[PDB]
Ligand binder design. Structure first.
Ligand SMILES: [Mg+2]
Ligand SMILES: [Mg+2]
Ligand SMILES: [Mg+2]
Ligand SMILES: [Mg+2]
Ligand SMILES: [Mg+2]
Ligand SMILES: [Mg+2]
Ligand SMILES: [Mg+2]
Ligand SMILES: [Mg+2]
Ligand SMILES: [Mg+2]
Ligand SMILES: [Mg+2]
Ligand SMILES: [Mg+2]
Ligand SMILES: [Mg+2]
Ligand SMILES: [Mg+2]
Ligand SMILES: [Mg+2]
Ligand SMILES: [Mg+2]
Ligand SMILES: [Mg+2]
Ligand SMILES: [Mg+2]
Ligand SMILES: [Mg+2]
Ligand SMILES: [Mg+2]
Ligand SMILES: [Mg+2]
Ligand SMILES: [Mg+2]
Ligand SMILES: [Mg+2]
Ligand SMILES: [Mg+2]
Ligand SMILES: [Mg+2]
Ligand SMILES: [Mg+2]
Ligand SMILES: [Mg+2]
Ligand SMILES: [Mg+2]
Ligand SMILES: [Mg+2]
Ligand SMILES: [Mg+2]
Ligand SMILES: [Mg+2]
Ligand SMILES: [Mg+2]
Ligand SMILES: [Mg+2]
Ligand SMILES: [Mg+2]
Ligand SMILES: [Mg+2]
Ligand SMILES: [Mg+2]
Ligand SMILES: [Mg+2]
Ligand SMILES: [Mg+2]
Ligand SMILES: [Mg+2]
Ligand SMILES: [Mg+2]
Ligand SMILES: [Mg+2]
Ligand SMILES: [Mg+2]
Ligand SMILES: [Mg+2]
Ligand SMILES: [Mg+2]
Ligand SMILES: [Mg+2]
Ligand SMILES: [Mg+2]
Ligand SMILES: [Mg+2]
Ligand SMILES: [Mg+2]
Ligand SMILES: [Mg+2]
Ligand SMILES: [Mg+2]
Ligand SMILES: [Mg+2]
Ligand SMILES: [Mg+2]
Ligand SMILES: [Mg+2]
Ligand SMILES: [Mg+2]
Ligand SMILES: [Mg+2]
Ligand SMILES: [Mg+2]
Ligand SMILES: [Mg+2]
Ligand SMILES: [Mg+2]
Ligand SMILES: [Mg+2]
Ligand SMILES: [Mg+2]
Ligand SMILES: [Mg+2]
Ligand SMILES: [Mg+2]
Ligand SMILES: [Mg+2]
Ligand SMILES: [Mg+2]
Ligand SMILES: [Mg+2]
Ligand SMILES: [Mg+2]
Ligand SMILES: [Mg+2]
Ligand SMILES: [Mg+2]
Ligand SMILES: [Mg+2]
Ligand SMILES: [Mg+2]
Ligand SMILES: [Mg+2]
Ligand SMILES: [Mg+2]
Ligand SMILES: [Mg+2]
Ligand SMILES: [Mg+2]
Ligand SMILES: [Mg+2]
Ligand SMILES: [Mg+2]
Ligand SMILES: [Mg+2]
Ligand SMILES: [Mg+2]
Ligand SMILES: [Mg+2]
Ligand SMILES: [Mg+2]
Lengths: 67, 217
RNA sequence: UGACCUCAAAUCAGGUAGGACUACCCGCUGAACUUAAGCAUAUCAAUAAGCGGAGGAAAAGAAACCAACAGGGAUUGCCUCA
RNA sequence: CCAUCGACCGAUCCUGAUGUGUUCGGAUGGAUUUGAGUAAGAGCAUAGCUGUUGGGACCCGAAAGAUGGUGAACUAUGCCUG
RNA sequence: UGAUGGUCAGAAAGUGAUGUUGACACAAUGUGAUUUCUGCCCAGUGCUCUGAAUGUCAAAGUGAAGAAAUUCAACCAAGCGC
RNA sequence: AAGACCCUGUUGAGCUUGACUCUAGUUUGACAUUGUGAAAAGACAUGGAGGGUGUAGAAUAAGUGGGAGCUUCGGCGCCGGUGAAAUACCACUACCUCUAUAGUUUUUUUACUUAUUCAAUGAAGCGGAGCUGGAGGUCAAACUCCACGUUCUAGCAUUAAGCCCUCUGGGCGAUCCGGGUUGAAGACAUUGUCAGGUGGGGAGUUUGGCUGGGGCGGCACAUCUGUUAAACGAUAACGCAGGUGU
RNA sequence: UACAAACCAUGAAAGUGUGGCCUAUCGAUCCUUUAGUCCCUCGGAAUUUGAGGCUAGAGGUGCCAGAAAAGUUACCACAGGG
């Protein structure tokens, strides 16, 4: 009826410098409007990414990091 | 309530006579062009209106005229009367867009005689006439020079499709109060032509080929 | 160190109010019996009872009146309107 | 004075002249209609008996309703002190 | 019923009872020591609970027409309905 | 002892209840009490300035009433040709827009405190800032945070000691400033007036007749046919057999 | 029910037809609504709305000459009645 995906804005996720491959990926959220900013409703999100991805090496395949 | 302010228009034609006798100008007299504002109406939606009565004194002091035809015409406007015509293009023309377009854009008023009943909706029609021409009711046993000198006094007041219609006439030769109320003897049509009559007024401006606006209604 | 404004105190100086009467008078408040052959609007009634306040009278009173006439001319009362 | 048939005035209905602010006017002639009328006034006033209505209403009589006041010396219950 | 409270009082109040109180309390009911138990029914009448969408829906307010009085229409709280 | 049972009365009262009609209270809405900001979606109004066609005029009209270099100049020039409407125009009006001034204006959110509301105290220490330490690790230079005299004991603590200046007195001791006593709450409650709901807690009243007592039944209560009805007509019973509100 | 004055239907006509072959099959005041006359009034004078009048229907009273109306009293009262 409305296709709610027309109002989504994409953001990039950056990991801390302790890891090597700091470009974790992308997320989305409802686009920032007058009533609600996208920023405040976006902080506090938790991403679970494999440690092997954050370092390239497969030796960390059995650990997964919450960011 | 009727926004008639004759005493207000007395001091305003003086302020018109300021920039037409005092203040600064070329030297002399010109075209009085006092305006209005006009609100509370609607250019579309409703209908149309018109009203012609010959004003007290002489408006157009240099009225432009072009008398049509030669049949019962001209022979009444020779010698003491100027203008007239010599048909000529009434048999040619009729295929040129101009000449008739030139006649309309040059002179300011024609006539209607008793034979022009043909030419107005035949030789012109969609070519002219209906574009904004008003034939003058003139015949034989009539007032002659009196009713065509009052043609200078014959003002209009028709409706188009714009909320302006702030036209005026006259000249500055008038005495200290020959206008003022002569203009008020022209507001009668503009009153009784609008829907709510004396209500559809948005502003009023005193002005000519000379002034701006001196705080009026 | 003195004005002003507002607010206080005194057994300050001098005054004033209260309470009473009931017949009449100026207001507030306010029933029901009754009548309607029942009864609720109505009626009794803008009355009884209750409260406040005067006087020889009180109140009202010199038009933000009546009129619709050929016009009257503060208030009050009687007769009439009815 | 009685019975009956008529006439006049008002209301209602019908007709609708000269005329005219062309919508007013309403002459004239009618109608099993209608009025507490006219048709040579009869009333006003005082008094009396009788009858009527409102009033306490021929006299006496409720169970009820309302308003304003007086009681916990009996007694019910709490408290205080014995 | 956790005090901006429950239950109750007063015509009102800058007014009161519980209250020198605070859920082992105050207030409102039913049954009626102990023993052993208190089954099925929420359709009705109550009581109670939510209202994201929602039929009904007052005054005020809104919009339109009208010269106005006014009329019509939309919206529409609680409640009812669900 | 003017039956207390029974009936009648257009006589009551106590009590009950979705009988009729109301009502205290309460609840819900609106208006007033009622003020100050910010933001959102937006609408307006006012000040600006600026903007435009499909052809044709190469020339971007969007409007309708008119002459003449005005501004040194003369860039472009002022009706005559190209358009339905004319190339400095002007004198101003009228529209409209899409930019800006920080103007009033509805619905939603959250900020303020002075109205209002709650409470306490013998209105005692409030707000802000500053001295001192404890820290952050200082990477300029002292920014941030914390604290700033009392904890084995059923004692005691009251009407300043001490120091500085000399001024039978002033300052420190006892840091400065603001005189908002201190909290809560806040333009919402509350309160006033109407409006809708709820309201046996309470108020007022009513709750036919006939009738072989009354009640229940029935309707003989408005009525029609035949008979009772006794040969005009009339004639009763909760008499007989039946009917009507279509 | 029989006519009077209209306007009609039917029938060749005379005639008949003013609801149902006859004897039952129904409804005041106040209020509202519709029709009619397009007539009178809104009272300082007018216009247009609005309102009020006059005449005829309808909305209904079945307790049918026409109140707006639930119970209980073994707590009971009064006026009476053989
Ligand atoms: Mg003294
Ligand atoms: Mg006294
Ligand atoms: Mg009273
Ligand atoms: Mg009496
Ligand atoms: Mg009575
Ligand atoms: Mg009686
Ligand atoms: Mg009674
Ligand atoms: Mg009264
Ligand atoms: Mg008295
Ligand atoms: Mg007195
Ligand atoms: Mg005295
Ligand atoms: Mg005297
Ligand atoms: Mg005087
Ligand atoms: Mg007088
Ligand atoms: Mg007098
Ligand atoms: Mg009399
Ligand atoms: Mg004639
Ligand atoms: Mg005639
Ligand atoms: Mg005539
Ligand atoms: Mg006449
Ligand atoms: Mg008579
Ligand atoms: Mg006589
Ligand atoms: Mg007596
Ligand atoms: Mg008597
Ligand atoms: Mg008497
Ligand atoms: Mg007595
Ligand atoms: Mg009573
Ligand atoms: Mg005692
Ligand atoms: Mg007792
Ligand atoms: Mg004792
Ligand atoms: Mg409480
Ligand atoms: Mg108070
Ligand atoms: Mg408690
Ligand atoms: Mg129980
Ligand atoms: Mg118990
Ligand atoms: Mg037992
Ligand atoms: Mg048991
Ligand atoms: Mg059980
Ligand atoms: Mg089962
Ligand atoms: Mg159930
Ligand atoms: Mg249930
Ligand atoms: Mg409403
Ligand atoms: Mg309303
Ligand atoms: Mg409105
Ligand atoms: Mg809505
Ligand atoms: Mg609702
Ligand atoms: Mg509900
Ligand atoms: Mg007796
Ligand atoms: Mg007795
Ligand atoms: Mg008994
Ligand atoms: Mg009786
Ligand atoms: Mg009673
Ligand atoms: Mg009773
Ligand atoms: Mg009793
Ligand atoms: Mg408010
Ligand atoms: Mg304090
Ligand atoms: Mg606060
Ligand atoms: Mg408020
Ligand atoms: Mg209120
Ligand atoms: Mg109510
Ligand atoms: Mg209420
Ligand atoms: Mg109740
Ligand atoms: Mg009762
Ligand atoms: Mg009986
Ligand atoms: Mg009965
Ligand atoms: Mg019965
Ligand atoms: Mg019976
Ligand atoms: Mg009867
Ligand atoms: Mg017989
Ligand atoms: Mg017989
Ligand atoms: Mg006939
Ligand atoms: Mg009049
Ligand atoms: Mg009737
Ligand atoms: Mg009737
Ligand atoms: Mg009866
Ligand atoms: Mg009854
Ligand atoms: Mg018993
Ligand atoms: Mg019994
Ligand atoms: Mg006997």
């Amino acid at each position: 009826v409305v296709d709610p995906f027309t109002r989504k804005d994409w953001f990039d996720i950056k990991a801390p410098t302790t890891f090597e491959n700091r470009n974790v990926g992308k997320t989305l959220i409802n686009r920032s409007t007058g009533l609600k900013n996208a920023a405040d409703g976006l902080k506090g999100r938790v991403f679970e990414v494999c440690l092997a991805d954050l370092q390239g090496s497969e030796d960390h395949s059995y650990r997964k990091i919450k960011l | 309530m009727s926004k008639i302010t004759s005493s207000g228009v007395r001091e305003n034609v003086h302020k018109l006579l300021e920039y037409s006798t005092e203040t600064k100008k070329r030297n002399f007299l010109e075209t009085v062009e006092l305006q209005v504002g006009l609100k509370n109406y609607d250019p579309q939606r409703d209908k149309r209106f018109s009203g012609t009565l010959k004003l007290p004194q002489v408006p157009r002091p240099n009225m432009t005229i072009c008398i049509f035809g030669d049949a019962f015409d001209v022979d009444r406007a020779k010698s003491l009367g100027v203008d007239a015509m010599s048909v000529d293009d009434l048999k040619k023309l009729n295929k040129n867009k101009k000449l008739i377009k030139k006649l309309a854009k040059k002179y300011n008023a024609f006539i209607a005689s008793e034979v022009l009943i043909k030419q107005i909706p035949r030789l012109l029609g969609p070519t002219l006439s209906k574009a904004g021409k008003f034939p003058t009711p003139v015949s034989h046993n009539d007032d002659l020079y009196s009713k065509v000198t009052d043609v200078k006094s014959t003002i209009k007041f028709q409706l188009k499709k714009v909320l302006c219609l702030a036209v005026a006439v006259g000249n500055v030769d008038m005495e200290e109060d020959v206008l003022v109320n002569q203009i008020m003897m022209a507001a009668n049509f503009l009153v009784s032509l609008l829907k709510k009559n004396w209500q559809n007024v948005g502003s009023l401006v005193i002005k000519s080929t000379m002034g701006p606006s001196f705080r009026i209604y």
